[PDB]
Specification:
binds zinc ion, metal-binding (chain A), 2,3-Dihydroxybiphenyl 1,2-Dioxygenase, domain 1, 4 helices, homodimer, six-stranded mixed sheet, 19% helix, zinc (chain A), 14 strands, biosynthetic protein, alpha/beta, Glyoxalase (chain A)
Chain lengths: 215, 213
């Protein structure tokens, strides 16, 4: 796993049961019928879905993207020098690896995962950053991962002031998944083009946002 | 501000306009501006902001901030005391240094390293917990054996009661029916040395306490 490569996405939601119904109906994910649910397709783990804990107030579930780093401590030392912020960690994760949470110069949050060790419809293909400051953010991420970063797995897309911004997971899909998701109660926020096909940014009924990569 | 002193509260709500409506009708706050500063008698009481503006997992509700002299030392101490660091330490402009922590029971609290009295004023925050002794030990290692013993306080509650840190705003008895007719629901009434306390679930679902004095 190259540095900066998208390696995992995780959904934290205040209604996990509804999220499982929605994403199983949209992507066909399987989970056996615990604080989290592993989502599988074609015998492979795709992602996980977990609970936002009991809260005395409203709560907004969102997808959390993780990019690979070779050394979480070096990444933590570099983040502030590149104009970002360390929000949590570096922290060890039960021998899975070492995790840090980082903010880029614009305040977009991203997980950085130092691991101690599929493509096809419904698979997690990558995460993309939607940003109104692609030059500032881009310099940050290329200083952290290298000059090749965000050149054509991860990508950086320029968006206007009214679009969602931040890192969003991209799941492979057919054109027909768009009405499917709308019929399931999702709302399309934006349609843009990538080298490998159109992308549709979607707000799920729970309000979390993800991208359908139509290929 | 002594360590452990309640110094700030802030509301994150997905319907800020409704929150402004509700809290102005209940407390008389004035508001000015991504977030809204709430003022009373020319003094800032608290802030109200939008849950919607940022993406990712996000927890709405009222957040209480206790003062600390050293956010980095507090962060080092939290896990050793049986808690967890949830966010930070991070710098907040030149305003200060913040961390969010969970106590042994999982209750969330803000800790703020910094660089009003009257109806509607923010008086203090109180922790409602079913583990007042375990949690009390956590906070007393963080702030000293003095904390939560005869500004912040820790209340033992039963299994069905609300739990966590809640801000306490001074009010008259009449604020309770007022809040109810605005659509809130009372969760709990208990007694404090300085008067009764009424825990209220707002129409938006956030929870706060009315200190009737
Ligand atoms: Zn909270
Ligand atoms: Zn409300």
């Amino acid at each position: 796993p190259a540095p900066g490569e998208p390696t995992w996405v995780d959904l934290l939601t205040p209604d996990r049961g509804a999220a499982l119904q929605f994403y199983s109906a949209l992507f066909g994910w399987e989970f056996s019928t615990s604080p989290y649910t592993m989502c599988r397709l074609r015998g492979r783990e795709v992602c996980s879905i977990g609970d936002l804990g009991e809260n005395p107030g409203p709560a907004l579930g969102g997808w959390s993207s993780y990019l690979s780093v070779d050394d979480a401590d070096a990444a933590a030392a570099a983040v502030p020098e590149l104009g970002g912020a360390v929000l949590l960690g570096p922290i060890d994760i039960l021998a899975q690896g070492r995790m840090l949470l980082a903010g880029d110069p614009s305040g977009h949050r991203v997980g950085l995962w130092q691991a101690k060790e599929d493509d096809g419809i419904g698979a997690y293909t990558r995460s993309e950053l939607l940003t109104g400051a692609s030059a500032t953010d881009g310099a940050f991420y290329r200083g952290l991962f290298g000059a090749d970063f965000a050149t054509e797995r991860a990508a950086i897309r320029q968006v206007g002031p009214a679009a969602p911004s931040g890192w969003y997971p991209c799941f492979r899909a057919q054109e027909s998944a768009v009405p499917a998701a709308v019929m399931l109660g999702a709302s399309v926020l934006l349609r843009y083009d990538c080298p490998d096909g159109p992308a549709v940014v979607v707000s799920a009924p729970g309000g979390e946002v993800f991208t359908l990569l139509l290929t």
